[PDB]
Amino acid sequence: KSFERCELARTLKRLGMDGYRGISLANWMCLAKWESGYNTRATNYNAGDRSTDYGIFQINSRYWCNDGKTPGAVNACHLSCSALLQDNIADAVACAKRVVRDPQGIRAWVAWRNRCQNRDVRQYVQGCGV
């Protein structure tokens, strides 16, 4: 499914993402926007390291979820990558929370560094009632 902007914003807020490890909801919105355009089925195969990015946050199979086909990979979120392709994003959120509990925090995603870091991200949550 493709979320509407404010629909996703409230969905993320209800899931406890607002200020999680110091990350504002607007930053999470900007991340989802640039990673998948708010789409839960988005996938990207990386031919170089044989990994795949899954779902709304485009989480990578090399370290975060298990898809059984990524060489020498681990599963830090302890989830089948299938859980990251559900319309209900609860599992994807729990995994994103896991990702930011690591040292880099929200910087784990290069897209956030490119499109959100040091940028005005207010626009992602304006008028959503969050």
Curated annotation (Swiss-Prot):
It comes from the Eukaryota. Keywords: Amyloid, Amyloidosis, Antimicrobial, Bacteriolytic enzyme, Disease variant, Disulfide bond, Glycosidase, Hydrolase, Secreted, Signal. It catalyses: Hydrolysis of (1->4)-beta-linkages between N-acetylmuramic acid and N-acetyl-D-glucosamine residues in a peptidoglycan and between N-acetyl-D-glucosamine residues in chitodextrins. Residues 1-130 form the C-type lysozyme domain. Its EC number is 3.2.1.17. Belongs to the glycosyl hydrolase 22 family. Lysozyme C is capable of both hydrolysis and transglycosylation; it also shows a slight esterase activity. It acts rapidly on both peptide-substituted and unsubstituted peptidoglycan, and slowly on chitin oligosaccharides. Monomer. Lysozymes have primarily a bacteriolytic function; those in tissues and body fluids are associated with the monocyte-macrophage system and enhance the activity of immunoagents. It is linked to Amyloidosis, hereditary systemic 5: A form of hereditary systemic amyloidosis, a disorder characterized by amyloid deposition in multiple tissues resulting in a wide clinical spectrum. AMYLD5 primarily affects the viscera, and the predominant clinical features are renal dysfunction of varying severity, and intra-abdominal bleeding. Inheritance is autosomal dominant. This is Lysozyme C.
